[PDB]
Design a protein around this ligand. Structure first.
Ligand SMILES: *[C@@H]1O[C@H](CO)[C@@H](O)[C@H](O)[C@H]1NC(C)=O
Lengths: 305, 242, 146
């Protein structure tokens, strides 16, 4: 028998139904010292098994399907195309007469609409507003056809085909936003059609395009309240504005002479407004609200008299 | 008024229509335009109008004078697009060619799309006079057309929906003074106002740790109170009672 | 319930000018540099529309405009209920009020209050009521300059 690394992931790999799909054996980058080339040089092979979603036993992957529907290439297992039945738990195993190792992972085949509605989980692509010309690219197309084959690419916003917009232009594998606005938000789908061995194949990918505040308008934290013109004559809220910044950790906190309810609201361009509300001798104390982001640090004392 | 360069196509719009020079539907065409025909033309609808057309000799220098340029495009780092004037009167096809100070713009930085020119990585150094040139095709013959306009670049600054800092949302205060302050972002604002409203109609110095553009209207009645802040994004009201 | 008035000149996304011609009609075309273009007085009111994302907890509302030529201040931009045109007409009705949307740093849109979902847009060098669509959104975008 073999040694089992368990299940590589509990995230389903989602691939669209009736579209080619290449999924990689994770054994080489998540569990072993090896890489595929060195291993293949060391005189051992990679074999595949699976359990289909509606079954409770494992079967060898059948490599004798008509038109080589499922085939294995190096560390990849290829579907040409995918079928709805292939939803299941796959297992890749490396072996010789001396050594074995195996891992499993889930694959989910997804049905899509004519308007590309599906249980697929898209990536979110953020775009700086009104900040130069931006281009997105149809994702996960490499390795599906050689460079000699020039495919047909078509883009859609929602259900509607894009020929061109007054500020959007498609160029093959890329979609161009000349001056990104909020109005360009939405789901953009690329469809890639290419031939191979006499067959016609399609690959569909949906990207959520979201426009976010540009770096040029990025400011240090701005504290609205407290400010001098409010006085607490005896609950104090600290309301801080944060410009959107890509990989920034916005912070707001209170200090009572140097130590110790959070809520947040988002803009269209995803600028954040954070309010942290806090509440004898306590009226002597000096209450100061603090905030910090990548562009600086702010301080403002509340007046408690 | 209308104008064009000689040996260029010229097509004009006038505000059942009656008028070398041709006419199609309601439009008057010079193909090509030659300086002799520059005059005042009359259009009739069955009710009339006139425009004075001037044909010019191709400028000697590259800098074209102001009287053959179209309206200036006041651009910014947020609107770096220049439209080619009058181009949709002609029967034209992509691509339109662009020049800045009589020099061809050939780059990924200058992108031409429909009738627009987009300037990537715009900077103040891109100010100047831009000439678009396109082709109008009529019965197998291509006639060329150019138009020029100048273009400036101001660094904009952003704007937001107004935020009232004082007084707070749900407040009550006990010779009386109440200040209404709001911030609108940081930059140049076309419209930004703060005001007080007494029974829903218009009545008729140190600042917080903010870099933002803030305005304050102090209401003092020397003897329902609404604090309003507004710009093109909208208006927000905080009401105070006593 | 008038909030503020302000004069301004109106241009199009395609850098064309809107004009009011004596003996009044609307016109949309390019103009020569440094040729003084027409101005219009904008009156701003509180519209009934929510400020679409004013933020969590803030009851923002959008503004509502009515427009006049500066030359004569009792003429209004008026939207035709069933003819779908924008015309100048001679206490204005709901047909002369337009909810104002901020669409970019430099351009705004006028949704007809009398007929929700339709905006003022330029059509054959005129003003008409059209719908907002992504391919042709530039139809309904206008720049206000002082
Ligand atoms: C312009 O219209 C003509 C007919 O007058 C047509 O032949 C031509 O193809 C059109 N323009 C271009 C450049 O295609």
């Amino acid at each position: 028998r073999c040694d089992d690394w368990g299940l590589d992931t509990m995230r389903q790999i989602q691939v669209f139904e009736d579209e080619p799909a290449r999924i990689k054996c994770p054994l080489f980058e998540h569990f072993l010292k090896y890489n595929y080339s060195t291993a293949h040089s060391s005189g051992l092979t990679l074999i595949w098994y699976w359990t289909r979603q509606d079954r409770d036993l494992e079967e060898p992957i059948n490599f004798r399907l008509p038109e080589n529907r499922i085939s294995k290439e190096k560390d990849v297992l290829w579907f040409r195309p995918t079928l709805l039945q292939d939803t299941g738990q796959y297992t890749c195993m490396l072996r010789n007469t001396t050594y074995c190792s195996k891992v499993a992972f889930p694959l989910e085949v997804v049905q899509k609409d004519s308007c590309f509605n599906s249980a697929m989980r898209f990536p979110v692509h953020k775009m700086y507003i009104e900040h130069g010309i931006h281009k997105i690219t149809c994702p996960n197309v490499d390795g599906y056809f050689p460079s000699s084959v020039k495919p047909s690419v078509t883009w859609y916003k929602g259900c509607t085909e894009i020929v061109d917009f007054h500020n959007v232009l498609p160029e093959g594998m890329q979609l161009s936003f000349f001056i990104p606005l909020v109005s360009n938000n939405g789901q953009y789908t690329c469809v890639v059609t290419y031939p191979e061995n006499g067959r016609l194949f399609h690959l569909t990918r949906t990207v959520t395009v979201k426009v976010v505040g540009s770096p040029k308008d990025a400011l240090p934290p701005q504290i609205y309240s407290p400010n001098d013109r409010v006085v607490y004559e005896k609950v104090i809220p600290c309301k801080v504005y944060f410009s959107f910044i890509m990989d920034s950790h916005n912070e707001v906190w209170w200090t009572i002479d140097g130590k110790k309810n959070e809520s947040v609201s988002y803009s269209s361009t995803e600028d954040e407004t954070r309010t942290q509300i806090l509440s004898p001798e306590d009226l002597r104390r000096n209450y100061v609200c603090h905030a910090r982001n990548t562009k600086g640090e702010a301080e403002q004392a509340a007046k408690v008299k | 008024s209308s104008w064009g360069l000689e040996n260029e196509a010229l097509i004009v719009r006038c505000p059942p229509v009656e008028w070398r020079i041709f006419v199609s539907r309601d439009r008057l065409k010079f193909l090509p335009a030659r300086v002799e025909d520059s005059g005042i033309y009359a259009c009739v609808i069955r009710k009339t109008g006139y425009l004075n057309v001037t044909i010019h000799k191709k400028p000697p220098s590259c800098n074209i004078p102001d009287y053959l340029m179209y309206s200036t495009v006041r651009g910014s780092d947020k609107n770096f697009k220049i439209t080619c004037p009058t181009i949709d009167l002609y029967n034209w096809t992509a691509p339109v060619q662009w020049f800045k100070n009589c020099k061809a713009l050939q780059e990924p930085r200058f992108r031409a799309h429909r009738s627009y020119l987009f300037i990537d990585n715009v900077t103040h150094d891109d100010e100047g006079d831009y000439t678009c040139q396109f082709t109008h095709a009529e019965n197998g013959t291509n006639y060329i057309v150019t138009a020029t306009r100048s273009f400036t670049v101001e660094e904009k600054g952003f704007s937001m929906f107004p935020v009232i800092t004082n007084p707070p949302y749900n407040h009550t205060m006990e010779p009386a003074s109440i200040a209404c302050s709001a911030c609108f972002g940081k930059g140049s604002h076309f419209l930004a106002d703060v005001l007080w409203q007494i029974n829903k109609t218009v009545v008729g110095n140190e600042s917080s740790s903010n870099d933002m553009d803030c305005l304050t209207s102090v209401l003092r009645i020397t003897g329902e109170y609404d604090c309003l802040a507004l710009n093109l994004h909208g208006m927000i009201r905080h009401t105070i009672r006593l | 319930s008038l909030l503020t008035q302000s004069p301004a000149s109106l241009s199009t996304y395609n850098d064309q000018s809107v004009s009011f011609v004596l003996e009044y009609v609307i016109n949309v075309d390019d103009s020569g540099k440094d040729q003084e273009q027409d101005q219009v007085l904008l009156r701003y009111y509180e519209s009934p529309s929510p400020a679409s994302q004013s933020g969590d907890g803030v009851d923002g509302k959008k503004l509502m405009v009515n427009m006049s030529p500066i030359k004569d201040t009792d003429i209004w931009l008026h939207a035709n209920d069933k003819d779908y045109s924008v015309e100048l007409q001679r206490s204005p009705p709901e047909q002369a009020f337009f909810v104002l949307h901020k669409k970019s740093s430099d351009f705004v849109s006028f949704e007809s209050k009398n007929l929700p979902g339709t905006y003022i847009g330029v059509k054959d060098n005129q003003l008409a009521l059209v719908e907002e669509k992504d391919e042709s959104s530039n139809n309904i975008m206008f720049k206000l300059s002082k």
